[PDB]
């Protein structure tokens, strides 16, 4: 059932993830320092962290089979709308249910709900974000399923502004059938039970998290003194 092409797809995506996710988190020392000890003390550090992650998402997307057959405009539209969602997906790797925090190797780079609030965000986003991270973690995805979901998230034909939606759908369909077939052939029960439908539900959850983050980002970035603390890439991708 899992064809040669589908095994090839999975190998490329696993490699692309390995080349764009550094589980040592060594680069975090380059970011502006976290401030925790009211002001948005974490915004400089978390702006750099987000900006760093946007670069990784772009590097991943470029290696998705078929992605660079799209036009430049379509590649841009897809990354602009999905980047926030893939950052949330990718962040699940560091999330720990022990204390509902994101553990990036050390105490200074361990992020909880208070850190996210200290970048300007409210429980309207943070509570559903934690619920998302908990429900994704409980799926106990294979790494194969994790990177397929990130790629399916990126190549979505219903993103606003997409021009060649028929070609975007054809690329996504190739990835969806790869994932559907992978689960059916390689994910043993009971973990496989309704797994594809649960994964697609998480993509719907991401659309709602996307909407809420965009709402709060527009509110935060509308104030020039906050925008001053963002990075140029964040302003270009998330908006200005």
């Amino acid at each position: 059932k899992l064809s040669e092409e589908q095994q090839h797809i999975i190998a490329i995506l696993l490699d692309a993830h390995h080349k764009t996710y550094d589980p040592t988190y060594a680069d975090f020392r380059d970011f502006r320092p976290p401030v925790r000890m009211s002001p948005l003390s974490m915004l400089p550090h978390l702006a750099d962290l987000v900006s760093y992650s946007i670069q990784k998402v772009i590097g991943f997307a470029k290696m998705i089979p078929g992605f660079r057959d799209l036009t430049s405009d379509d590649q841009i539209v897809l990354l602009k709308s999905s980047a926030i969602e893939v950052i949330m997906l990718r962040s699940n790797q560091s999330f720990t249910m022990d204390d509902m925090s994101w553990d990036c190797g050390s105490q200074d780079y361990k992020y909880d709900v208070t850190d996210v609030s200290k970048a300007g965000h409210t429980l309207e986003l943070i509570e559903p974000l934690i619920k998302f991270q908990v429900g994704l973690k409980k799926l106990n995805l294979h790494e194969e399923e994790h990177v397929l979901l990130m790629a399916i998230c990126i190549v979505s034909p219903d993103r606003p502004g997409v021009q060649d939606a028929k070609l975007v759908e054809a690329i996504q369909d190739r990835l969806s059938n790869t994932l559907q077939t992978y689960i059916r052939c390689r994910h043993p029960p009971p973990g496989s039970h309704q797994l594809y439908a649960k994964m697609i539900q998480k993509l719907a959850d991401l659309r709602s998290l996307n909407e809420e983050h965009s709402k709060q980002y527009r509110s935060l970035s509308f104030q020039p003194e906050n925008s001053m603390k963002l990075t140029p890439l964040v302003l270009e991708v998330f908006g200005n």
């Binding site: 430049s72 602009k80 890439l233």
Partner: peptide, 11 residues
């Protein structure tokens, strides 16, 4: 909306 940094990272 020109996206030169995104476009450059895609190149």
């Amino acid at each position: 909306k020109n996206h030169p940094m995104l476009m450059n990272l895609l190149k």
